[PDB]
PDB file of C-alpha atoms in Angstrom:
ATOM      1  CA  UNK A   1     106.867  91.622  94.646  1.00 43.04           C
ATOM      2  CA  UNK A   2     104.078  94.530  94.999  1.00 39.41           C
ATOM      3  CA  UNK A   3     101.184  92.480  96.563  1.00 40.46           C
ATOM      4  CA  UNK A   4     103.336  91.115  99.037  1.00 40.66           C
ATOM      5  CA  UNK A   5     104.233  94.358  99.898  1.00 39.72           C
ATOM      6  CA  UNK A   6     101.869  94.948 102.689  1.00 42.93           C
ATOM      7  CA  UNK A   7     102.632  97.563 105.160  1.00 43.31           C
ATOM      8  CA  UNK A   8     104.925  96.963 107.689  1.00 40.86           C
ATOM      9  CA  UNK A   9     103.699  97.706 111.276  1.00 44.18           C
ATOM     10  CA  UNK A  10     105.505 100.324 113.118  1.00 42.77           C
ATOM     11  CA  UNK A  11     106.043 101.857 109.772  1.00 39.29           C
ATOM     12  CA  UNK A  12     105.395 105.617 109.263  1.00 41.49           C
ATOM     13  CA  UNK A  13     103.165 105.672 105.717  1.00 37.10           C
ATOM     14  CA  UNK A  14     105.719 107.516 103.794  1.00 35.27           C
ATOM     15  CA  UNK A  15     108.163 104.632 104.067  1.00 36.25           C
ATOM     16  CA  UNK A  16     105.296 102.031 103.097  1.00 35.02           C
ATOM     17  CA  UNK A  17     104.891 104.579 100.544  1.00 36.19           C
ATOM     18  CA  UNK A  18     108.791 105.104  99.481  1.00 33.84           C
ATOM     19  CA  UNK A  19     109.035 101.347  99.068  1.00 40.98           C
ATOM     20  CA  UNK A  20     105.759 100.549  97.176  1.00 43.10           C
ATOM     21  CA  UNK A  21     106.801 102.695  94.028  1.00 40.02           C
ATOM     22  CA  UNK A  22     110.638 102.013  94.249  1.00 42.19           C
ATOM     23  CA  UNK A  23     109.167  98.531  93.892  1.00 42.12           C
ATOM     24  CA  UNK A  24     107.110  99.641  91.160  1.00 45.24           C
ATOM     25  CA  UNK A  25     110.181 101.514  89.342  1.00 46.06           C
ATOM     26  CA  UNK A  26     111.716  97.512  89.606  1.00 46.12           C
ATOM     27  CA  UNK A  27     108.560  96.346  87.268  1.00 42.09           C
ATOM     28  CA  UNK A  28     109.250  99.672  85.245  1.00 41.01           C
ATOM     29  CA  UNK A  29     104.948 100.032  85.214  1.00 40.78           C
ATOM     30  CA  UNK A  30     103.458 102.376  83.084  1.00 40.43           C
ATOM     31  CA  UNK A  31     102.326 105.742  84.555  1.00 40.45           C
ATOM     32  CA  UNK A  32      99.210 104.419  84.192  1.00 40.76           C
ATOM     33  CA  UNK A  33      99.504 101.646  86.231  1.00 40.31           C
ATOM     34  CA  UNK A  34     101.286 103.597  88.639  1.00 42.01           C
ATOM     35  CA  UNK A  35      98.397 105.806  89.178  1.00 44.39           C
ATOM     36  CA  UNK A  36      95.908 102.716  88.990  1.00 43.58           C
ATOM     37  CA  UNK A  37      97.639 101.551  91.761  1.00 44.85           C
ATOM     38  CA  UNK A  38      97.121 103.786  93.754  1.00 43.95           C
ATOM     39  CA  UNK A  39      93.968 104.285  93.580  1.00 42.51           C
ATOM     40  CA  UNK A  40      93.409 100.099  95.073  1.00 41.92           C
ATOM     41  CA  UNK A  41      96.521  98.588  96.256  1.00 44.74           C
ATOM     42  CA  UNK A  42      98.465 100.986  98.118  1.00 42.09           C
ATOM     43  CA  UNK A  43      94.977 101.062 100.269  1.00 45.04           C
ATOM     44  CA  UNK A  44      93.998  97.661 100.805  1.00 44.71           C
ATOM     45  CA  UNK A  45      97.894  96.829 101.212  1.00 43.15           C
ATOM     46  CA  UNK A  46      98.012  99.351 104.413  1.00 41.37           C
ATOM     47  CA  UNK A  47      98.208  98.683 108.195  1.00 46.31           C
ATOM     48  CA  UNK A  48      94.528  99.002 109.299  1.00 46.88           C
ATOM     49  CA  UNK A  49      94.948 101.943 111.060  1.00 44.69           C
ATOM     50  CA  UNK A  50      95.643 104.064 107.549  1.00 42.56           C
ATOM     51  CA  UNK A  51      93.696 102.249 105.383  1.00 42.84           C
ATOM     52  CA  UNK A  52      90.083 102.807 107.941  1.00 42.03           C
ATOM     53  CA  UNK A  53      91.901 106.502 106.427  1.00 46.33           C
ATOM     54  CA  UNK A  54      92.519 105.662 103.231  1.00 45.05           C
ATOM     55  CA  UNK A  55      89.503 104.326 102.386  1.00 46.61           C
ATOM     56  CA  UNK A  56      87.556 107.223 103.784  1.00 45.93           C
ATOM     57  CA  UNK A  57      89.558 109.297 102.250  1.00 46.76           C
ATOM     58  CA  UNK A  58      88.555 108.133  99.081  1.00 46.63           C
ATOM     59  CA  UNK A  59      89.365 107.185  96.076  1.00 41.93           C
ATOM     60  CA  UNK A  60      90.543 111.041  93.774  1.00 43.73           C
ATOM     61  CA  UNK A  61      92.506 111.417  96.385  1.00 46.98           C
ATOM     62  CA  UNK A  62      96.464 112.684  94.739  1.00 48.54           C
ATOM     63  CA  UNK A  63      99.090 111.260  97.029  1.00 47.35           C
ATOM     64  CA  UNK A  64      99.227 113.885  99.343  1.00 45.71           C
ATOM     65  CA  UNK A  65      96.105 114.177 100.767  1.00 43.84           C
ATOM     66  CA  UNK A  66      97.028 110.713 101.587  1.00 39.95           C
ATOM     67  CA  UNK A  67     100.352 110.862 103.019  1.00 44.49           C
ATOM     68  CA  UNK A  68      98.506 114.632 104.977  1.00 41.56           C
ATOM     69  CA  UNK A  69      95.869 112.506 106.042  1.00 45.48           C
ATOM     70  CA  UNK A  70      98.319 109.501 107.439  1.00 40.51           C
ATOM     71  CA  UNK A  71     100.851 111.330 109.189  1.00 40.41           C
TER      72      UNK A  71
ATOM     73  CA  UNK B   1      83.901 100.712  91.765  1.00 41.82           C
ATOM     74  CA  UNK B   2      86.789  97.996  91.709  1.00 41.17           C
ATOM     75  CA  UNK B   3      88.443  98.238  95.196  1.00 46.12           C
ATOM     76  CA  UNK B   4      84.955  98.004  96.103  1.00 40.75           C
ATOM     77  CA  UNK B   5      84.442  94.518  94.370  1.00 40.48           C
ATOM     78  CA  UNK B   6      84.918  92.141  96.522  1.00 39.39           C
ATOM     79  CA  UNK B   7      84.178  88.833  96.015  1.00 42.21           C
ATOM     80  CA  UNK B   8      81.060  88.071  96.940  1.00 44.25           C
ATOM     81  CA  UNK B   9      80.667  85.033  99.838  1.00 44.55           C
ATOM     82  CA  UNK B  10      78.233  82.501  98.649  1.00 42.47           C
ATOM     83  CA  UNK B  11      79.794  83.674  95.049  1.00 42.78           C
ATOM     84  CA  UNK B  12      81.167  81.196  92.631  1.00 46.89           C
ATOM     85  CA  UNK B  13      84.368  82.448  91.685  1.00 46.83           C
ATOM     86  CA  UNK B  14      83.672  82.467  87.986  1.00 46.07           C
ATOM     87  CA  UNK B  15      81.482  85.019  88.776  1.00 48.14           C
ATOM     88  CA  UNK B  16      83.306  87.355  90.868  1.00 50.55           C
ATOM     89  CA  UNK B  17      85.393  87.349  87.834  1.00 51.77           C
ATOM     90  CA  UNK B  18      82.837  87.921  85.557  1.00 50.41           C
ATOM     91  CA  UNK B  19      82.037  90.916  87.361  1.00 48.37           C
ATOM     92  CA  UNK B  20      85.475  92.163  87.759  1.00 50.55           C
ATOM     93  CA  UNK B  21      86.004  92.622  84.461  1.00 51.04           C
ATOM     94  CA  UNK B  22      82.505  94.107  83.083  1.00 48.66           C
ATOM     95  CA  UNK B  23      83.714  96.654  85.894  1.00 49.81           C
ATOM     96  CA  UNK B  24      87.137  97.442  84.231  1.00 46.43           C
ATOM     97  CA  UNK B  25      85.120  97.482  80.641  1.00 48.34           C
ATOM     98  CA  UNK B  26      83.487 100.471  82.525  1.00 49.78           C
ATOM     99  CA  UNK B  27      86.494 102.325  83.359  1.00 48.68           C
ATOM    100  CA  UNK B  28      87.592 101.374  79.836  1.00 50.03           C
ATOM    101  CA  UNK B  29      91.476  99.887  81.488  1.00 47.78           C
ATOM    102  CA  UNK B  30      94.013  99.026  79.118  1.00 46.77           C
ATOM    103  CA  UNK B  31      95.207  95.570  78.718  1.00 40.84           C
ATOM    104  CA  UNK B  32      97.993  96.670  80.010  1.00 42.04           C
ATOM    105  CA  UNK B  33      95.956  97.175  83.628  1.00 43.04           C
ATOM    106  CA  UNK B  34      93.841  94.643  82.985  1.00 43.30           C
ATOM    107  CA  UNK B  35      96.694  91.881  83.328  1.00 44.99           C
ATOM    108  CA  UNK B  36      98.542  93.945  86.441  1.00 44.45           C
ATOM    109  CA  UNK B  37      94.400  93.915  87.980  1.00 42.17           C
ATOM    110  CA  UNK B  38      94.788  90.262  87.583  1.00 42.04           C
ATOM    111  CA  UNK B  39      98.106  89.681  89.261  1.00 41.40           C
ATOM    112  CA  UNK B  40      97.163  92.069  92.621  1.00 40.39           C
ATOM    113  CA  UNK B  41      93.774  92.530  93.722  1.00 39.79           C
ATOM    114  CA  UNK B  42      91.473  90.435  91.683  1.00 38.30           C
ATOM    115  CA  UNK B  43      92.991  87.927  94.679  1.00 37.31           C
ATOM    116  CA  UNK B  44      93.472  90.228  97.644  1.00 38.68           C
ATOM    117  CA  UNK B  45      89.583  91.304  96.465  1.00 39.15           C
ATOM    118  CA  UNK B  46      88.577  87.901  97.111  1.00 42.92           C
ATOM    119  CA  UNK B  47      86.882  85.459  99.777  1.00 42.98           C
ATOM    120  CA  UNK B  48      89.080  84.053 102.321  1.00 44.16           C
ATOM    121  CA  UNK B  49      89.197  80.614 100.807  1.00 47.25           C
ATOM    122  CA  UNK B  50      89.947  81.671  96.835  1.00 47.33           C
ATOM    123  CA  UNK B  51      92.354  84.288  98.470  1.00 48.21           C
ATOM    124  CA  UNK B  52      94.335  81.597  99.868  1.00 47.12           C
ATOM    125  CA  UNK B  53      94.386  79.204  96.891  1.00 44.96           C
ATOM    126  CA  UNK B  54      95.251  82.031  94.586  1.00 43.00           C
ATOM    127  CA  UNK B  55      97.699  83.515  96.979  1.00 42.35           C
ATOM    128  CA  UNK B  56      99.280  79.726  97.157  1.00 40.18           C
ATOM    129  CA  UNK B  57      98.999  79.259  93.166  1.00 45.22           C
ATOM    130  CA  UNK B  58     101.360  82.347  93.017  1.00 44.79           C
ATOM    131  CA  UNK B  59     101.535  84.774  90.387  1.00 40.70           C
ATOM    132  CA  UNK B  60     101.895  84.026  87.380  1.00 37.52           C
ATOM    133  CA  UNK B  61      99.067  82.559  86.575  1.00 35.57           C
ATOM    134  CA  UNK B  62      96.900  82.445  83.622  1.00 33.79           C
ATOM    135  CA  UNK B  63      92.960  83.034  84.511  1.00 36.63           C
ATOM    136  CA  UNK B  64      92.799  79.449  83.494  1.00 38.89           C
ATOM    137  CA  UNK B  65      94.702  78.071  86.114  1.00 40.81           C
ATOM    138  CA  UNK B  66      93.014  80.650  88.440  1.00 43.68           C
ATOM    139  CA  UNK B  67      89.419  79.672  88.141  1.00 41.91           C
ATOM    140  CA  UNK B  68      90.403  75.765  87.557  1.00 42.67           C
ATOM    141  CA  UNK B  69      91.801  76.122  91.006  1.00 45.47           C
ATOM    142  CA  UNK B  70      89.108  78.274  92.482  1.00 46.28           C
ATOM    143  CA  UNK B  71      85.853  75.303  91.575  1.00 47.55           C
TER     144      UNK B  71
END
């Protein structure tokens, strides 16, 4: 269900965001993968206007340097 | 290092693979990621033909059936 959720287009990140892990909570992943997730997916799995952010944002980042940086 | 592996375009995919991996030795991933690695990226992270395959081959896939498809 997770890799096919890409981001939707007009969709502010939080929401891409809000749906990713309540996915996630669905495939009950560990906290580990949650965070290893992150880290990749939630990236590469972004609308390519924040996800040119995301990935110069860089990986370390916690979650809200990347929802600050995507508003 | 592993959202930045990407597969590699005159790369057999065997290889790509075989990098993957000896990457996710490094950052020492449970099997537990290992096998959610598998399921995500390790095909998003690939070229544009074996990206397609393995998109169409669906999870659930064992590597197996992944590189058998991927020749």
């Amino acid at each position: 269900s997770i890799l096919d959720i890409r981001q939707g287009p007009k969709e502010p990140f939080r929401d891409y965001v809000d749906r990713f892990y309540k996915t996630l909570r669905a495939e009950q992943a560990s906290q580990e993968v949650k965070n290893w997730m992150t880290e990749t997916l939630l990236v590469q799995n972004a609308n390519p206007d924040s996800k040119t952010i995301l990935k110069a944002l860089g990986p370390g980042a916690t979650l809200e340097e990347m929802m600050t940086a995507c508003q």
